[PDB]
Amino acid sequence: MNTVPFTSAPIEVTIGIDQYSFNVKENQPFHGIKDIPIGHVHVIHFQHADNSSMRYGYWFDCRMGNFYIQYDPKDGLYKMMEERDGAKFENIVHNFKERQMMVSYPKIDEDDTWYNLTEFVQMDKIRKIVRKDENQFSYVDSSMTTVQENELSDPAHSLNYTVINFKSREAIRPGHEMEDFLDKSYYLNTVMLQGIFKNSSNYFGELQFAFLNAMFFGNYGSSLQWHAMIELICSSATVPKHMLDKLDEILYYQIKTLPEQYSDILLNERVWNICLYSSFQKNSLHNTEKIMENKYPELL
Amino acid sequence: GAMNSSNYAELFNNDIKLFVDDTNVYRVTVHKTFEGNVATKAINGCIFTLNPKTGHLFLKIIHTSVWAGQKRLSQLAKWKTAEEVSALVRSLPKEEQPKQIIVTRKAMLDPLEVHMLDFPNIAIRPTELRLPFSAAMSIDKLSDVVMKATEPQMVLFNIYDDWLDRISSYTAFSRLTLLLRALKTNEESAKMILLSDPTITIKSYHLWPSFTDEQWITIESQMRDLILTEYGRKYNVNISALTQTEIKDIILGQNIK
Numbered sequence: 001m002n003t004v005p006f007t008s009a010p011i012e013v014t015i016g017i018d019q020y021s022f023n024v025k026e027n028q029p030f031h032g033i034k035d036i037p038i039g040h041v042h043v044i045h046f047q048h049a050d051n052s053s054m055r056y057g058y059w060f061d062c063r064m065g066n067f068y069i070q071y072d073p074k075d076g077l078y079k080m081m082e083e084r085d086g087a088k089f090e091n092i093v094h095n096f097k098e099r100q101m102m103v104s105y106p107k108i109d110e111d112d113t114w115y116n117l118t119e120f121v122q123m124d125k126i127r128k129i130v131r132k133d134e135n136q137f138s139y140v141d142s143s144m145t146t147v148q149e150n151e152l153s154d155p156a157h158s159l160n161y162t163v164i165n166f167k168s169r170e171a172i173r174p175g176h177e178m179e180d181f182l183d184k185s186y187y188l189n190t191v192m193l194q195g196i197f198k199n200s201s202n203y204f205g206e207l208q209f210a211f212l213n214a215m216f217f218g219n220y221g222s223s224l225q226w227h228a229m230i231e232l233i234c235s236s237a238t239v240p241k242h243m244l245d246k247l248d249e250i251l252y253y254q255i256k257t258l259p260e261q262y263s264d265i266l267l268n269e270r271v272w273n274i275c276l277y278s279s280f281q282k283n284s285l286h287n288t289e290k291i292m293e294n295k296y297p298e299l300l
Numbered sequence: 301g302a303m304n305s306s307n308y309a310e311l312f313n314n315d316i317k318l319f320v321d322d323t324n325v326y327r328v329t330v331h332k333t334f335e336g337n338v339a340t341k342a343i344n345g346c347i348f349t350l351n352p353k354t355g356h357l358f359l360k361i362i363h364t365s366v367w368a369g370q371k372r373l374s375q376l377a378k379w380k381t382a383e384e385v386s387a388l389v390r391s392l393p394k395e396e397q398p399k400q401i402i403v404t405r406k407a408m409l410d411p412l413e414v415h416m417l418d419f420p421n422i423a424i425r426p427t428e429l430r431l432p433f434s435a436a437m438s439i440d441k442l443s444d445v446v447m448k449a450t451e452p453q454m455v456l457f458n459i460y461d462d463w464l465d466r467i468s469s470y471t472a473f474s475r476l477t478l479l480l481r482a483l484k485t486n487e488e489s490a491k492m493i494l495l496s497d498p499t500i501t502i503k504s505y506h507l508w509p510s511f512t513d514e515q516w517i518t519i520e521s522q523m524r525d526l527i528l529t530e531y532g533r534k535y536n537v538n539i540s541a542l543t544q545t546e547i548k549d550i551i552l553g554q555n556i557k
């Protein structure tokens with residue numbers, strides 16, 4: 001079970017670790033997070049107490065290095081860093097653990113929530129969406145725009161989600177205009193799955209990452225990408241049964257985890273109504289349909 | 301954005317533009333079957349593609365064979381319209397291609413946008429104008445070429461005849477919309493107004509009669525009288541009692557959506 005120490009907590013902040021969160025007071029003797037489950041990506045995230053516009057975090061995998069958090073008083077944020085000296089890192093973690101200055105990743109044994117939300121998410125695909133090749137971890141924040149949003153402006157600080165655009169030459173074969181616009185199967189199966197993603201696992205990984213960035217950072221472009229990737233499948237008459245069954249599980253756990261209070265900002269009425277009640281796949285998402293109708297019947 | 305009352309003069313500037321009206325593309329008669337069910341029978345239709353500055357009308361005749369063995373015809377009709385407008389644009393030399401295509405019905409926007417992806421600089425716009433282009437098939441020579449067609453055909457017309465020799469495009473378009481609105485409202489009364497003086501004929505090469513400038517003023521009056529008479533009949537309104545600005549705001553509230 002891996003550990004992310006913190007040098008200190010000089011400013012009052014809400015710290016998220018995956019779906020959990022806790023409040024740290026200004027100069028509280030907080031020195032990090034232990035017992036982080038090996039075998040999944042994780043996200044550590046921040047929202048400053050004195051400025052809720054500061055909302056940002058780091059995707060990481062403790063299998064790829066020894067990572068810690070240090071506050072930078074010049075740039076005014078908590079930065080992830082990699083410790084290259086294994087012996088120093090072990091000694092720092094040991095001292096803090098002995099002094100009980102770390103919170104424990106509060107995983108209930110029966111609880112697969114985080115696996116369910118990150119099943120297809122891999123750190124190597126994250127590092128291609130978020131381009132900073134000198135670090136093994138990835139910074140995301142609430143204001144980062146997508147390559148798509150930038151087209152419709154700093155290219156280095158952008159989320160390189162796969163561009164999906166239903167009224168584009170990529171989506172529509174000349175000669176098959178009506179066919180391809182009303183049935184997105186060509187665009188999903190040939191262009192996106194066979195061509196760009198190579199397989200459904202990569203497509204679902206990007207969909208899951210987009211949702212998590214929308215939920216944890218309120219990242220608007222991420223929310224757009226998440227909905228576009230659901231709509232592209234729901235709007236396709238021809239989708240492998242395994243992919244529909246898997247999508248129903250993916251969406252069920254995303255809707256289950258979404259805070260009730262953020263449902264008005266995180267859920268697009270048009271896409272969800274279209275996907276559940278009008279689309280080719282309106283009868284293929286039984287679990288997602290049931291949780292949506294029981295949790296968010298006002299949206300529908 | 302949307303073409304409305306505010307931006308009407310834009311229709312008569314030197315930027316090539318076309319109106320596309322798809323009302324008459326898919327046309328049916330509805331009848332009882334032997335078993336007492338209901339069936340449709342398609343009849344020949346047309347796409348009404350008009351340059352409002354020049355009067356050039358590209359009348360694509362939609363022959364009933366287009367529909368044979370096809371499903372969801374009202375949906376397909378929009379996409380067939382978009383396919384044919386995009387084929388017409390590709391057929392025109394570059395200097396004749398429109399800068400803008402204004403669709404009379406908002407349901408034509410996505411079909412036309414998708415067919416015109418290869419022309420990202422041609423703007424596809426809706427309009428707030430209520431235009432009576434559905435009444436094209438009340439023009440005897442247009443109805444005749446559509447119904448006689450035995451195969452898909454494009455026929456070119458100037459819907460203003462020679463009017464632009466004497467009047468501006470603004471005035472010609474105003475005259476056309478008034479005539480079509482009158483034909484839409486009461487076809488038989490409108491035709492009787494146009495055809496009643498046997499000494500004024502339609503030239504072989506024209507759609508409308510050969511009225512002098514003074515006769516066009518009389519005809520226009522008679523058409524505005526027909527439209528107001530029919531509004532009174534429809535709403536049970538005493539027209540004789542209305543003021544001149546009441547009358548203005550009915551005749552030209554009917555050509556906004």
Ligand SMILES: CC(C)c1noc(=O)[nH]1
Pocket residue numbers: 005006007066067068070083088089092
């Ligand atoms: C670099 C130093 C401040 C450090 N703190 O925790 C670490 O793993 N390294």
